[PDB]
Chains A and B, each alone.
Chain A
Amino acid sequence: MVKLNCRPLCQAPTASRLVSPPCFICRG
Chain B
Amino acid sequence: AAPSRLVQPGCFICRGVAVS
Q: How far, in angstroms, from A8 to B17 measured CA to CA in the complex? A: 43
Q: A25 to chain B: which residues have CB within 8 Å?
A: 17
Contact with B along A1-28 (1 / 0, CB 8 A): 0000000000000000000101101000
Q: How far, in angstroms, from A12 to B15 measured CA to CA in the complex? A: 30
Q: B13 to chain A: which residues have CB within 8 Å?
A: 23
A residues engaging B (CB < 8 A)? 20, 22-23, 25
B16 at the interface (CB under 8 A from A): yes
Q: How far, in angstroms, from A28 to B14 measured CA to CA in the complex? A: 19
> How near does chain A come to B19, taking the closest CB pair, in angstroms?
10
Whose C-beta in chain B lies nearest to the C-beta of A23?
B14
